[PDB]
């Protein structure tokens, strides 16, 4: 090792080769009449089937002794179970299927977004820009789509509202209306914040993934070699942290609605 830090490979086509920005907020792949399927939805499909195959392999000949994929999946599930019990221990099983699948799908969607070619592969000038048709990129992260993040947020909001109605009765006088005291003023702000929560979560995840994608692409544009490695690692960490905190905030909001 010593002091061999030279960065000679770094000074390779600083900004001449790779395209300048070439980013978009939403794109559509279509391909069928009627529903315009998008590349982000396509990745959600390939992630979903990959998750299904992974779960099957982990459950393939379920043995009492854990090993390999079964062992790591058990460790992940038990760590999540303990983490959720640390907040509430009465409703862990009720919300566990939703929370666990949310975390697992979001984590793999974020990690797949950092795979190479998510911006390079699509159907300066690259390949398709040479022809007369614009190069729409393929393999877009599902969290980069609002229609996915908003769907997850509204699903979580429906779940939390249904369970907060099923428990504690349908009263909600702490947030609906109060007769006297400042509680009347508190309840309206509580209702407003509750309405905010799904939008806040959806925007949080969507942005924290899409901005990471944009940053990795743009740092591939300038000094493409050997510099964006720590930032790729940081984006892996960001995707993992976001996937975790989405589920954590979901369960915490559910428990606080129970209270």
């Amino acid at each position: 090792v010593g002091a061999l830090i030279i960065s000679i490979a770094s000074r390779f086509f600083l900004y001449t080769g790779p395209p300048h920005v070439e980013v978009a907020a939403e794109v559509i792949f279509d391909g069928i009449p009627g529903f315009p399927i998008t590349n982000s939805f396509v990745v959600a499909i390939i992630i979903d089937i990959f998750v299904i195959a992974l779960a099957v392999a982990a459950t393939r000949n379920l043995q009492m002794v854990p090993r390999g994929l079964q062992n790591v999946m058990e460790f992940i599930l038990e760590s999540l179970y303990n983490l959720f019990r640390n907040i509430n221990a009465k409703y862990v099983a009720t919300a566990f299927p939703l929370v666990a699948t949310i975390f697992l799908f979001v984590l793999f969607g974020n990690w797949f977004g950092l795979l190479p070619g998510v911006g390079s592969i699509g159907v300066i000038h690259d390949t398709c820009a040479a022809q007369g048709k614009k190069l729409v990129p393929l393999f877009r992260a599902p969290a980069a789509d609002l229609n996915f993040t908003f769907a997850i947020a509204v699903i979580s909001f429906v779940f939390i509202e249904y369970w907060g109605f099923r428990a504690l009765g349908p009263g909600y006088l702490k947030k609906f209306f109060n007769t006297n005291g400042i509680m009347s003023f508190v309840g309206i702000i509580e209702f407003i914040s509750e309405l905010v929560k799904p939008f806040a979560l959806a925007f949080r995840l969507f942005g924290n993934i899409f901005a990471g994608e944009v940053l990795l692409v743009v740092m591939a544009f300038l000094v493409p070699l050997l510099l964006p490695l720590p930032f790729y690692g940081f984006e892996v960490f960001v995707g993992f942290i976001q996937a975790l905190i989405f589920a954590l905030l979901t369960y915490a909001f559910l428990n606080i609605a129970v209270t």
Partner: protein, 39 residues
């Protein structure tokens, strides 16, 4: 912001949740609880 795309994404997420509950969540908890049950 395509309502059809949002509906499709919600349907895919719900199907994934159901599949995981019926194939992954149920067996993992059963195996995990068995250890405590064994304990």
């Amino acid at each position: 912001i395509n309502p059809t795309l949002f509906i499709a994404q919600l349907i895919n997420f719900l199907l994934l949740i159901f599949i995981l509950r019926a194939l992954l969540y149920r067996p993992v908890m059963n195996l995990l609880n068995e250890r405590t049950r064994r304990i």
